[PDB]
Amino acid sequence: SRVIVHVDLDCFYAQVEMISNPELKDKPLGVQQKYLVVTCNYEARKLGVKKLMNVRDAKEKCPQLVLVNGEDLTRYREMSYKVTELLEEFSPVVERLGFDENFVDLTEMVEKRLQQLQSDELSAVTVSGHVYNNQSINLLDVLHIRLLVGSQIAAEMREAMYNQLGLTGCAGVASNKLLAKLVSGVFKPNQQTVLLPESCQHLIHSLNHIKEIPGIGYKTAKCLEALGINSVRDLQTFSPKILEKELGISVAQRIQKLSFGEDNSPVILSGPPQSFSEEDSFKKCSSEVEAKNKIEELLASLLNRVCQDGRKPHTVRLIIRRYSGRESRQCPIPSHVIQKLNYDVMTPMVDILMKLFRNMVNVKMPFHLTLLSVCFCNLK
DNA sequence: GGGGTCCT
DNA sequence: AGGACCC
Ligand SMILES: Nc1ccn([C@H]2C[C@H](O)[C@@H](COP(=O)(O)OP(=O)(O)OP(=O)(O)O)O2)c(=O)n1
Ligand SMILES: [Mg+2]
Ligand SMILES: [Mg+2]
Numbered sequence A: 001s002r003v004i005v006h007v008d009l010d011c012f013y014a015q016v017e018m019i020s021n022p023e024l025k026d027k028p029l030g031v032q033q034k035y036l037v038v039t040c041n042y043e044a045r046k047l048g049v050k051k052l053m054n055v056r057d058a059k060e061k062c063p064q065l066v067l068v069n070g071e072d073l074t075r076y077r078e079m080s081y082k083v084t085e086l087l088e089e090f091s092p093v094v095e096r097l098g099f100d101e102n103f104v105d106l107t108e109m110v111e112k113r114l115q116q117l118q119s120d121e122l123s124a125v126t127v128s129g130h131v132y133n134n135q136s137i138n139l140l141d142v143l144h145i146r147l148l149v150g151s152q153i154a155a156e157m158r159e160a161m162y163n164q165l166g167l168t169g170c171a172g173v174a175s176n177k178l179l180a181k182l183v184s185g186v187f188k189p190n191q192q193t194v195l196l197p198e199s200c201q202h203l204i205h206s207l208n209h210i211k212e213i214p215g216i217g218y219k220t221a222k223c224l225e226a227l228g229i230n231s232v233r234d235l236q237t238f239s240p241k242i243l244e245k246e247l248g249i250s251v252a253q254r255i256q257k258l259s260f261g262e263d264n265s266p267v268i269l270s271g272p273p274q275s276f277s278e279e280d281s282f283k284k285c286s287s288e289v290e291a292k293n294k295i296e297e298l299l300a301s302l303l304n305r306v307c308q309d310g311r312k313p314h315t316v317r318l319i320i321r322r323y324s325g326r327e328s329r330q331c332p333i334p335s336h337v338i339q340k341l342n343y344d345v346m347t348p349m350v351d352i353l354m355k356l357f358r359n360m361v362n363v364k365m366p367f368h369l370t371l372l373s374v375c376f377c378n379l380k
Numbered sequence B: 001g002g003g004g005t006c007c008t
Numbered sequence C: 001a002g003g004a005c006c007c
Helices: A012-020 A041-046 A055-061 A074-090 A105-114 A140-163 A175-186 A199-208 A218-226 A230-235 A240-247 A249-259 A287-310 A346-360
Strands: A003-009 A029-033 A036-040 A066-069 A094-097 A101-105 A169-174 A193-194 A275-285 A313-322 A327-334 A367-380
Touching: A003 A041, A003 A074, A003 A140, A012 A029, A012 A036, A012 A074, A029 A041, A029 A055, A036 A055, A036 A218, A055 A218, A074 A140, A105 A140, A140 A169, A140 A218, A169 A175, A175 A193, A175 A199, A218 A240, A218 A249, A230 A249, A230 A327, A240 A249, A275 A287, A275 A313, A287 A346, A287 A367, A313 A346, A327 A346, A327 A367
Parallel strands: A029 A066, A169 A193
Antiparallel strands: A003 A101, A003 A169, A029 A036, A094 A101, A275 A367, A313 A327, A313 A367
């Protein structure tokens, strides 16, 4: 009974970079974070570059590959919010998934448009983009009609994103979030597809690995494989009783429904972010003098972002990762420090973070850190 | 990697 | 505070 759209930008970081430096939009491009090419444009994907590939492999598999540094997410994050604000203008319930994916619940919009339709141009209702599995449309099936109106709205969304933000992307229209996300990637890049209900099982069985189901991640998949469960059909067919006692009642029941293409989870309004964090990874930090400097660097960056936002963070968290898996310490922020917008907030904040740091790290005995992160949360 | 979410 | 998920 729902019409959901999943919007997925084409090679997002690379797209932002190509727009920033149009001298790049004609060469194979890779966006680099440390030793990783986290994403690349479709010209590089032709030359055999894949997501999250090593720069050694990349530089060898494509020596003409242009690399730009994408460790600072500032510009990506800003464009990311322009996209979801644009979608929110179509319909206010927009759920973000990472920086480059959004779900919108179109069912009220679709119903409104259909109520405005007369007899002449309901003939007449046509699909925009691809129909998954090339299945024939039945114009007398109200479910088909509602999903086709969905595809028209999705086309308007992609058109607005291009005309207003210069961005291309894909869309998937289906009856729930799981299916919309699975179907959006069927034709890429810069294309869209709609899933009609009688093709649901074809879509779910098209998957080759159980980890390809959104909601089934690394740990869960490893567990399932441990159990002899490898195909979607294996999971569909496994004993609920055993699954429940192996993974617990909540996860087992949820993921088994997913394996049938069933997902009743609502599209949630993401709204403003609930946390701001910054991190830096490194080979080695083994002193407190370094720690403090790193933390000060991160803290400075964060205060720029708190300042921009408006709301104020009421707790701080320090996160670490030691050599050879993360640990954290948090505490409320003193009320007087919370009012800064002018003064000197650095020293009192670094004082707090260093205490947390010494709480976790025993500095009287040697240590080896490989990541540091500062997070502001509990915003008001 | 450099983010972000929610539940236990 | 830690674990699991998503990108
Ligand atoms: N461990 C990971 C996995 C993902 N990413 C980033 C790179 C991508 O920009 C985005 C997730 O990748 P997508 O699946 O959205 O793929 P892209 O948007 O990069 O390209 P496309 O959608 O065309 O496949 O988040 C990341 O930072 N770290
Ligand atoms: Mg994308
Ligand atoms: Mg998965």
